[PDB]
Amino acid sequence: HFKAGTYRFTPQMTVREMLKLLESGKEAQFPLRLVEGMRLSDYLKQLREAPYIKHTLSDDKYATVAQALELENPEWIEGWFWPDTWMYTANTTDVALLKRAHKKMVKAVDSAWEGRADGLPYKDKNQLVTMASIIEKETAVASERDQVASVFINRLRIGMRLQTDPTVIYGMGERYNGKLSRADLETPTAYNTYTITGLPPGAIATPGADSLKAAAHPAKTPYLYFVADGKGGHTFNTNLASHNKSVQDYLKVLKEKNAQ
Amino acid sequence: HFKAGTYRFTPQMTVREMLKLLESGKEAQFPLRLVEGMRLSDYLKQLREAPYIKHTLSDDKYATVAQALELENPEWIEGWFWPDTWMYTANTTDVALLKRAHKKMVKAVDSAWEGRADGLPYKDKNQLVTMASIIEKETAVASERDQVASVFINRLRIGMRLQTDPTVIYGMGERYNGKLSRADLETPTAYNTYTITGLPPGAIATPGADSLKAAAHPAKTPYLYFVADGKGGHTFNTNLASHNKSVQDYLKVLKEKNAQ
């Protein structure tokens, strides 16, 4: 009844202690930090490069991952993995580790969904995840998260295009080279929220618990616009004319800074 | 004859193999990714949270770390650590891992220094490291790295203030809330390159091999200015008139993007 694994051998260890250790099953555990804001394709490259991972995935395509995970909806994949420092034992498969990540996300989502605020325009749980991923990728201060959420949810409710750059970046796929021009924002893809109305078909990244909570409980504001203030915050507005003013304020601040 | 450590035992392992393993010293390796562009304080936090690290440092103050590593000049600390995925065996001390990181950087810096381009304005190796950390924190696109480097080194040579924001941030220390204003830019500190001429007294982050190379071999250009082009890249200039034009060009791009 010997339990295989990675064990710790002290200098003057006894035979008595060693047999106890080799049966205890108390293995050394390895870290895999799966960080919020990253994609599954990021997580899959980490798994390939991680020490002592049994590679049971034929390739790192998303559909293969949905196959191996036996997902009910294989289009509901991105954003459905809980971000954490995951502890694994040596020779654990990639699939079982992703399975643990998926099941933990499902639980957190279901709790967020059932506890969500009244009158949100999400049709399903994937849309809550999609919105959460949009909130996560919108680079802001922690204090402004609820308001950023509010703007996007308000827009989704009334039929205004979301116009968020990360969704455009996602929709380009491997054509994105680090640059984002005006032509890129103008080219229609299924994810481009400058061209499409509503949420994109799925999430764009892995949402943190911070974003998921903001998607489920946004601030109660009438805001429909935000722009950088030039410090490193944002000014929030309810109408186009106020917004356009706040845009001019931002450019003044930038001119005063970048020009000599 | 027997070497103590953390080893892995397969289910069908023979006693022949176990004997071989327990002498070999080929332990389980644990990963720690120390990323370029991060500070030593970021690495120190990572060591506090890393599994199976023996924590010997009294505190994570840089003077403590300098004393424990026994540096000749304790002021030459920031930036002097090689960024990589470092493999450590269990029960390795925090100090021993940092010592490995330091030594590898020293070797890399010495090699960069001796092979460097002629007529660069650096007095010592710490200045090369300081400049490299400045290039590291400013470079957003890899094809523009040697030209960013060129601008800063051009300025350093002729006595034009470097006016680089990450150094203002470093100089504020814990007073930096996450936001940077005009008041922050105009307040003198030892690191503030809007007020001081030349390099700050030490590096501001860990440079990668990319930035360290660019600090030793910048592109031969007449540029003294760069500004964002509005679409991911930068536009480089030799004079203030041309730069102020490029600033105006950038502000129009932001006007078209943000205002509706």
From Swiss-Prot, chains A, B:
Disruption phenotype: Inactivation leads to a significant increase in glycan strand length in the mature peptidoglycan matrix. Deletion mutant shows impaired membrane invagination and cytokinesis, and reduced sensitivity to ampicillin. Inactivation of the gene can restore growth to a strain with a lethal deficit in aPBP activity and a strain defective in the activity of the elongation system, which utilizes a SEDS/bPBP synthase.
Keyword Lipid metabolism: no
Reported impact of E138Q: Lack of activity
Site feature: Important for catalytic activity: E138
The keyword Transport appears for this protein: no
CC annotations in GO: outer membrane-bounded periplasmic space; plasma membrane
GO BP: cell wall organization; peptidoglycan biosynthetic process; peptidoglycan metabolic process
Keywords of the record: Cell inner membrane, Cell membrane, Cell wall biogenesis/degradation, Lyase, Membrane, Transmembrane, Transmembrane helix
Major location category of this protein: membrane
EC code: 4.2.2.29
Membrane topology of the entry: Single-pass membrane protein
Gene Ontology molecular function terms on file: lytic endotransglycosylase activity
Compartments, as annotated in UniProt: Cell inner membrane
Family per similarity comment: Belongs to the transglycosylase MltG family.
Subunit field text: Homodimer. Interacts with PBP1b.
Name of the protein: Endolytic murein transglycosylase
Annotated source species: Escherichia coli (strain K12)
Lineage of the organism: Bacteria, Pseudomonadati, Pseudomonadota, Gammaproteobacteria, Enterobacterales
Positions spanned in the full protein: 81 to 340 of 340
